Structure 1
């Protein structure tokens, strides 16, 4: 409706923001929000000196025009200033003198753009380079009114942002989240949850030893016969989504208001959306009640990020201890309970072993599960205390030796589904197999999962099998490529829906990175201390069962 100057003159802002090096007062119990990324500068330069990929983005966003689109904009513009009217078409960039003087010399003036400097102290006079000056903010709307520009971009710094934001002159913010912590003296202003709303989250990337992503904030309110062919080919599609009334999508205003959902966490989130909306109502094993669907695939680029969900808090100590426990060959539930890892406690009780008909199994003797099948597949299992040295097939050695000696084998599979020993296990494995693939000094891993609890379980599963990939890759002197997660029976407990709905409306943060201690070169030689998650920025912990 009507039109503010921001809409009319197509004036956007572009920035790139750090986390700040505060003296945290014995509180690794840290809360994170949109204001977490503000850091703009330090001693008159960027706090990270150079981020090569952001520098690529910033250029491509400021140096892009479509001539085609210009016609419409020249109308709506000229008709409003009430004055109705070869080089090339170009974008404007607006910068504070301080920012101008903090840009290196080689970049000045910014190629194929219309460089403008807001300054009161200096004037066209003082600048030995091809520019325009101005000494107030109203003076820019004027320079815009006259010139041949496709879009105008506010490229900082803080002072210039704060005032342009105050008088709501900016239509969108193209905002780079640099997901590391540096020293900062200057800061981006507290963006107003009311006035501006994220509408788009890019992919996550690694550049110069840090992950980063690109989001878009939007200002608040208040062939054609080939398109018909689409409608005809969609003629048999059911009228509305099956559990529409049942889940009520109008609740996910934010999830649905996003245009571009290119953050990899959306791979998980969209499966949760898909199941809630089109999932089959099933009720048994307990009468507990699930929405279920069959056969999904998620791919994470471990070279660019560690995919630890950011739409809730996750803890990995337990997940890692469990991984190290499989690797040692162990089936002894006590080892994990002494480290207060209680993943397997429920499946070791006398009651649970008795329902599972294992009347002759010691409590917490989980039987021939992951660890035993990894290092001794085929061996007759006895009890958790037996050393099975040299008995059965050590698949874990075998697949590590296949990667090193025969990277191009298509038989690098690690299988926990021993059909002979299923009934002897406390619980047959949810995680059926990993298969590996080596290209050009790079390791990908497929994990097939028969049964996927999506609100409690798969989030941990992603992390486990991502960590395991790294461990394998390092041990075989390879770079990790993709973790590919194949979901079989994929289900949401009805108990989880209220919490997953809260979750779906949270905008993921840039993912963290995993640092393995590089000295560890045998799969058996990892210690809990060898693992570090770095720069994990996350929303509040969610109880998935909202019970009390």
Structure 2
């Protein structure tokens, strides 16, 4: 009785694994994973057995794999004994003679063939599944990996990797069958109530935890966002705010996202990437005219720019969509005297963005690459004080650009998915203009909250297992950061779950 594992690489939506006798992709790192996972063993005087169908045996050229024994399932192949590295069996059950005897075989791997995969799962021979999810869907397949039966549960999901602009990750599924420290912490939590800080940061219950069977392998960085939702649902205090809609709120949180091997665009929900880009280039250009976004069919700033809202907050003198000195006016004209959105501000104020770009490439190891929007002198004139308040940038020794952001207030349902993608694009833009590669993104949050009219929606999103992040590439090298257009951006391999409608609190 030894272990039997499936190794397979399948597409993210339809589970395609083959086409015309070969693979529908060419990913070198995935073959290295197959090699390392099938060679891994404890006893040096034993070998691992790789079971595969005859058509897969043809596709690998009918040549042996070093250090391993290949088991071919075939009805017509001659049961040859000349090659000790290749053995032939007439059916899959008989090949499980690797179990019944042969103590020189340590582990068994079901290595390919839809027919072999389907029979191994149908007869309940498989203990573990190593799955490489490939983000390629609008191509032709003729061979599929069968649906994983309900007896299996995921226990690991890696970060997203990139090869030739193709996104992929690695997952492990398993077939389902000291206390002294945990007891002491429980007893201390009964004695001290909320006096014990751990009781103020309770671990989320299973019913609000995304894919709960993945306990020690939540490596995919979309869990950084999903688990923050779970923490708010678990520990969030019911609080009122300036809007009529109350929230559940906690204070002091963070999220990390990689940007070297993928782009952090959420997959558990279709995110309006075009509106995100249009808002960001609107910031970069220094613009505060809300009509320019509406003219581009972007209405995210409509609520905080209506005549009724502006009059209510004491800005009735202002034009309809004149939002005042907000993001993009502090970026390009910090401390500049604001009049209206139609005036000419060329030369007024401190151009933070221009100075940031120059210091990033003239003094990369400088510890002061800072862009701020919190101006106490201008807060009263803003339609809304800045939420993403301050950001810092860092040039690594291997010429990557990382970004930290402090956010004072985080609408997790609507604002947060935008903020993650927004500063990811901005860091990539700064990276290209300064001649670096994208690095890492960290977001530090003050008031992280969920509006109570988003509870049904966000619990729906928490029921969806994440998929690998897509890739985002620029189609050309711009001469100035203001020259970026929506046509220059290419989003590769984005296969999200359907859209989830959520209303904005004015």
Give the TM-score of the pair, scaled to structure 2.
Answer: 0.91
* Whole-angstrom CA distance in 2 between matches of 1:253 and 1:461: 23
Number of equivalenced pairs:
497
- Point out where structure 1 has 5 or more consecutive residues left out of the alignment: 1-7, 19-33, 68-86
- Matched residue, 2:291: 334
Q: CA deviation at 1:52?
A: 2.2
Deviations 1:294-348 (A, max 9, x none): 1112111111111111111111111111111111111111111111111111111
- Give the match for residue 512 of structure 1: 470
Counterpart for residue 379 of structure 2 = 422
Q: What SS class does the counterpart of residue 188 from structure 2 fall into?
A: coil
1:366 is aligned to 2:323: yes
Q: How does 1:18-417 map to 2 (within 5 A)?
A: 18=11, 36-49=13-26, 51-66=27-42, 88-104=45-61, 108-125=63-80, 128=83, 130-148=85-103, 149-181=105-137, 183-192=139-148, 194-219=150-175, 228-229=180-181, 231-232=183-184, 235-237=187-189, 249=205, 251-252=207-208, 255-259=211-215, 260-417=217-374
Question: 1:53 deviation in Å?
Answer: 1.9
Write out aligned runs for 1:419-458 (5 A).
419-439=376-396, 440-458=398-416
The CA distance in 1 between the partners of 2:118 and 2:400, in whole Å, is 45
8 Å contact from structure 1 (residues 500, 544) kept in 2 = no
TM-aligned CA deviation for residue 109 of structure 1: 2.1
Report the RMSD for the aligned CA atoms in angstroms: 2.7
- The equivalences for 1:464-503 within 5 A come to 464-503=422-461
Cα distance change on mapping 1:130 and 1:136 into 2, 3 Å = same
Query: Offset of 1:286 from its aligned partner?
Result: 3.3
Take 1:490 and 1:185, find their aligned partners in 2: how far apart are those partners?
44
Instruction: Give 1:43 shift.
Output: 3.7
Task: Give per-residue Cα distances to partners, 1:448-469, cap 9 Å, x unaligned.
Answer: 1100011221011101111111
- Secondary structure of 2:379's match? coil
Aligned equivalents of 1:204 and 1:541: distance in 2? Answer: 22
Q: Deviation of residue 359 (structure 1)? A: 2.6
Give the match's secondary structure for 2:234: helix
Gaps of 5+ in 2: none
- Taking structure 1 as the reference length, the TM-score comes to 0.84
Question: Per the alignment, do residues 233 and 196 of structure 1 end up closer, same or farther by CA in structure 2, a change over 3 Å counting?
Answer: closer
Deviation for aligned residue 1:146: 0.9
- How far the C-alpha of 1:217 sits from its partner, in A, is 3.0
For 1:182 and 1:66, how far apart are their aligned partners in 2?
41
CA distance in 1, matches of 2:51, 2:496: 33
Counterpart secondary structure, 1:306: coil
Q: Give the C-alpha shift of residue 437 in structure 1.
A: 0.3
More displaced 10-residue stretch of structure 1: 476-485 or 276-285? 276-285
Deviations 1:197-256 (A, max 9, x none): 4343222112343121112233466xx6xx6356435642358997999x9945348632
